[PDB]
């Protein structure tokens, strides 16, 4: 038997079994798709990166650029997507060579739990045992029943990767960073694109001075985005589909993405013969360790409580087989940034001001504006800026978020400052290249460390 | 209170950090402050 | 009169006037130009920020962006130069706002020692006083007696700058940071590029095999980089200039970029009335805490000993002041990035592998390229690495060094890291964003925690 058992080869997954592997554990990891990498390189992430980089700048040299004069931009679609699809099989290939390179085996099937310590592979028939088990069977997209997807008209985050043709009008079911990321790629292409959001704000995850600034710029930027509006059904019909809103209002597109959120995903693992179930929300409860209820199975990843993120799941990871190795192991959650990837990029990382003030958590906040920015002067930009929360009393850098060119970059330092539990003044009074936008980030800490 | 891998080292060898000294930014013990003792 | 007089308006004058504001202090400032800002402002940093970014999207958009055609590409100059001189205006009204706004006294004019506590500003005839008195009178190009430039034909980086036309051919002398900048801004606006250089390698403040990736990247993109060329004369003509090499080789060009180096500047400063003097390299020597041989005199910036960097004489000026004022005062210079804004960029941070051969420190290797990274991929880039260089016993980070697409901005983490002694480990350990630049460094990191 292995030493350790992975189901699924996602981000969770698959930086498990390498970093098990690298502690001298035999890996085995079960996967049901072709190809290794999880949603996030299969659909998620990586291609859905390809998409915004390329279009960002197409979408560019459309609206014109500084110092020149183009004199026509035409899409080659299929181009766009050979490049996404190149990307893909690039990284999906890179996660096979790295398990061969690390002596991980890898079985194709699903994995069924037969008992808390045996796993059947139902489409090969292999019973497989292992001391330790890892569950990393991560999310599926979640479709309310009165959104009727067919998976051509009305779809998902991965069709939506993949439309033959621009639509001319596309739908966005749902105002978080899948439907905000893939409307933008698609009307940066030249789609009318109209974003329908049930709360009084967009992008749940973001500050929400952030998540206000954003809804501004796209709207600038041509996307309507109508929140406080509740979808009540979606319905595929002719070349395109329908969607109803409460109140009667009914509108007409050729695509209409559903993105009301994702779901942990369980289905086929038989759970309940390991003598483990999930919660109200699909969740498997896992410890401080990441361990579920059974001691040696671990749950990671987007199939346990926690932000659905790539390098959390690939954290939790780490911290689970470290765990089971040497007996502990650690995830710095309030270190962990959140990315989104349109243009200007919205990140965050930390506690936001409505977390710190549920928890009645006095602060103090610095804020710099990319209009008083020297680099971003030259580059063109102009809007957006960074903030930081600082404790009112220790200084300790509590959160830090903006919007703006490339800040997810810019935030790279904040994580690491959040790492290292630093304080604003540590931030501001690090050395910081000029021109540079990582400046934005130091002005910004140096104002919350200098609050009254 | 000291670094990420300061932590981690201590936590292997079994060593409280009231007995590591921090050279680190601050009062922050250093992974070769550790290893120092 | 003032508690604090400061000569020099430049990056290193106008920071450290704005923090001995924030401490406290009356501040007088001395500048002879027009505009407040220095070299960085006027005719370095920002200017030169402003032709990169542009003219790099321009340069994209004619090789082709991926996904689309375009037609042409039809470079407009005037429009160029007016974001330039647009974005010159802005950073140079943003000093005076913060000047006026801080509460510190603008003189306009050279100023002269007429002792060790009081100064003349030659023009308008002030004779002023201070308790203390800062040095910040930065550097001018270096024009050996054999390079006649004549500031058309041939011309330093001011003039370079602003050429009326894109020129045939330009021929820059010196493969430095200027050099390669500033040929490489017109080259991808059509000119033909030589770069001269007398060493065996270029850009001599990189790490060596860093240096060696850039000229064989620019060598890539067009530009023609000959290094172990001792140019012996520069000699405008009728409509160009002849450039003369060491062995008899003559070349001849439109135009000729003389950037051999920068010189620290203290002309018409009259340092021998304050007792002061310059060394060999023109550098006004100074102690630990940036004091002359004269205790109430301090000096910064280009003008005295390190990096000709804004960042640099920023960080000086504010450890001078605070020395005034508090007793202390500390650079890091180990944590000091120093960037080269191309495309891809080139960075280094802390000691280069010569530097640590030379010092006899033993170290170990962390070395990760972007042809690995998956949002590398994802832009369309392959090109690239980052490397981290750690203590062999310590692990702690002695330096970091890249080239790549925004290889600077990935670095900003690497400076804090530096800044808090962290170990490669530690960096390699805290959270990344997925999929991210910084992802390179954080690889780069854990390979050289994990080196054998
Ligand atoms: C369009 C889109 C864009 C995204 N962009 C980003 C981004 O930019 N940054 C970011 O951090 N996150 C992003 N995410 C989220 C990110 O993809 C997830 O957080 C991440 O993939 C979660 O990793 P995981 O290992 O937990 O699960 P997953 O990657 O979902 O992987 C689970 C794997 O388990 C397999 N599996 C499931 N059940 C079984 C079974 N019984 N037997 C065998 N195999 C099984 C699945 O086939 C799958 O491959 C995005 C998601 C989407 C949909
Ligand atoms: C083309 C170019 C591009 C550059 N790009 C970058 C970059 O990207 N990043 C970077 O970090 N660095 C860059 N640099 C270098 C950077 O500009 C310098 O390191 C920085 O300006 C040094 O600041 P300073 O305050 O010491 O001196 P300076 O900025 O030179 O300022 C000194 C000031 O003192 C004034 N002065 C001198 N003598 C007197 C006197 N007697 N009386 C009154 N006033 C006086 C001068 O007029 C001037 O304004 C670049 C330089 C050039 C030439
Ligand atoms: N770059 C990234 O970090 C990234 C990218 C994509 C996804 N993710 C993660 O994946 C998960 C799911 O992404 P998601 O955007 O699909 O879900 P989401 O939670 O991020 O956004 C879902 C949105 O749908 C809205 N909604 C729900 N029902 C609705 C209705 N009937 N009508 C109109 N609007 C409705 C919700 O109010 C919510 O704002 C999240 O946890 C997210 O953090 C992260
Ligand atoms: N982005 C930045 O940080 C940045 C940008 C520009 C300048 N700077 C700084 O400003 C200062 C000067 O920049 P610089 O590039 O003008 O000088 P430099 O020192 O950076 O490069 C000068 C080059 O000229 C070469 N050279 C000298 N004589 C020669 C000859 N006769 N023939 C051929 N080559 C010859 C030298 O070998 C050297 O490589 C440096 O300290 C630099 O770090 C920094």
Same mark, same amino acid.
């Given at each position: ?14 930086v498990?079994?390498?970093r ?18 999880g ?9 859905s ?7 960002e700048?197409?979408y ?10 183009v004199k026509?931009? &035409? ?10 699809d ?9 996660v096979?060579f ?16 037969l ?11 292999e &019973? ?6 890892l569950?990393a ?9 009165? %959104? ?10 991965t069709e939506?990767?993949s439309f ?5 009008r ?9 439907g ?7 009307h ?18 973001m500050?929400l ?16 985005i ?28 050729d ?23 999930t919660?109200?929300?699909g ?9 579920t ?5 671990? %749950?990671?990843?987007?199939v346990?409580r ?5 390098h ?5 990871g ?15 959650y309030?270190?962990?940034?959140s ?19 549920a ?32 404790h ?7 959160g ?18 959040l ?5 604003a ?19 910004? %800490?140096?104002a ?5 | ?13 079994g !060593?409280?950090?009231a007995? !590591? ?11 070769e402050? !550790?290893?120092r003792?």
């Open positions: 038997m292995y030493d350790l058992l992975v189901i699924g080869a996602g981000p969770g997954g698959y498990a079994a390498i098990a592997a690298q502690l001298g554990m035999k890996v085995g990891v079960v996967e049901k798709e072709k190809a290794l990498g949603t996030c390189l299969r659909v998620g992430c990586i291609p990166k390809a998409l915004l980089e390329t279009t700048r197409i560019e040299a459309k609206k014109g650029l500084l110092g020149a004069k026509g931009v &035409e899409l080659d679609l299929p181009a766009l997507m050979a490049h996404k190149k990307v893909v099989q690039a990284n999906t290939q890179g096979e790295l398990f061969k390179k690390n002596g991980i085996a890898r079985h194709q099937g699903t994995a069924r739990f008992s808390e310590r045996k796993v059947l592979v139902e489409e090969t028939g &019973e497989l045992e292992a001391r330790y088990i569950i069977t991560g999310s599926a997209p979640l479709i309310p029943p009165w %959104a009727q997807v067919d998976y051509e008209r009305v779809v998902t985050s939506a990767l033959p043709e621009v639509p001319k596309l739908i966005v079911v749902g105002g978080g960073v899948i905000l990321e893939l409307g933008v790629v698609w940066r292409l030249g789609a009318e694109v109209i974003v329908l959001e049930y709360m009084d704000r967009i992008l749940p995850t500050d001075e952030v998540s206000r600034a954003a809804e501004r710029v796209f709207k600038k930027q041509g996307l309507t109508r929140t406080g509006v509740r979808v009540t059904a979606v319905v595929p019909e002719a070349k395109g589909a329908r969607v109803e809103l409460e109140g009667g209002e009914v509108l007409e597109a695509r209409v993405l559903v993105a009301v959120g994702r779901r942990p995903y369980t289905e086929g693992l038989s759970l309940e013969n390991a003598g483990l179930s919660d109200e929300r969740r498997i409860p896992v410890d401080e360790h990441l361990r209820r059974v001691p040696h199975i671990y %749950a990671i990843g987007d346990v926690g932000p659905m993120l790539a959390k799941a690939s954290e939790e780490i911290a689970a087989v470290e765990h089971m190795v040497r007996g502990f192991g650690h995830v710095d309030q270190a962990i940034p990315v989104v990837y349109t243009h200007p990029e919205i990140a965050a990382v930390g506690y936001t001001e409505e977390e710190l003030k928890q009645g958590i006095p602060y103090k906040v610095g804020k710099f504006p990319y209009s008083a920015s020297g680099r971003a002067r030259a580059m063109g930009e102009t809007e957006g800026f960074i903030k930081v929360l600082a009112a009393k220790t200084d300790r850098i509590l830090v978020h903006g919007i703006g060119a490339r800040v997810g970059d810019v935030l790279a330092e904040a994580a690491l400052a790492f290292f539990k630093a304080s003044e540590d931030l501001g009074r690090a050395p910081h290249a000029h021109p540079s936008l990582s400046e934005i980030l130091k002005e910004a %800490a140096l919350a460390w200098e609050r009254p | 209170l000291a670094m990420p891998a300061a932590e981690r080292l201590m936590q292997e060898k !060593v409280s950090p007995e !590591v000294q921090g050279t680190g930014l601050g009062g922050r013990i250093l992974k402050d !550790v290893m003792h």
